[PDB]
Swiss-Prot record:
Signal as UniProt keyword: yes
PTM annotation: Binds 1 heme c group covalently per subunit.
Part of the full-length chain shown: 23 to 104 of 104
Subcellular location field: Periplasm
Main location: periplasm
Recorded GO CC terms: periplasmic space
Name of the protein described by the UniProt record: Cytochrome c-551
Function text: Electron donor for cytochrome cd1 in nitrite and nitrate respiration.
Keywords: Electron transport, Heme, Iron, Metal-binding, Periplasm, Signal, Transport
GO molecular function per UniProt: electron transfer activity; heme binding; iron ion binding
Binding site for heme c: C12, C15, H16, M61
């Protein structure tokens, strides 16, 4: 299983992309930002289920989508992109 396949199996790519910006953060850009900053993961996945705060865009992402597992996976892919 891959988080890139799971990232496209839901609706992340609706505005994410693994290399472009639109509504949500570019996953690859997240890699080019955080890069070696793993101190959350729980509240990072909480963003995937409660909307962001506003770093690249002032429009938080649609909160709620799953539980807190299928997201936890795509939550470490962001922090762990390359
Ligand atoms: C558009 C309809 C989105 C969908 C569908 C998903 N995301 Fe998203 N995401 C979106 C926005 C508007 C934002 C915040 C705006 C800003 O630039 O800050 C985000 C951001 C994230 C983040 C955290 C980014 C951070 O600052 O490091 C993550 C980890 C994230 N989004 C996860 C994620 C996943 C896993 C999705 C599918 C399950 C997904 N997003 C969909 C917009 C949208």
């Amino acid at each position: 299983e891959d988080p890139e396949v799971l990232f496209k199996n839901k609706g992340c790519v609706a505005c994410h992309a693994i290399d472009t910006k639109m509504v949500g953060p570019a996953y690859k850009d997240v890699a080019a930002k955080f890069a070696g900053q793993a101190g959350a993961e729980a509240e990072l996945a909480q963003r995937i289920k409660n909307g962001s705060q506003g770093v690249w865009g002032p429009i938080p992402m649609p909160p709620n989508a799953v539980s807190d597992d299928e997201a936890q996976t795509l939550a470490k892919w962001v922090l762990s992109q390359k």
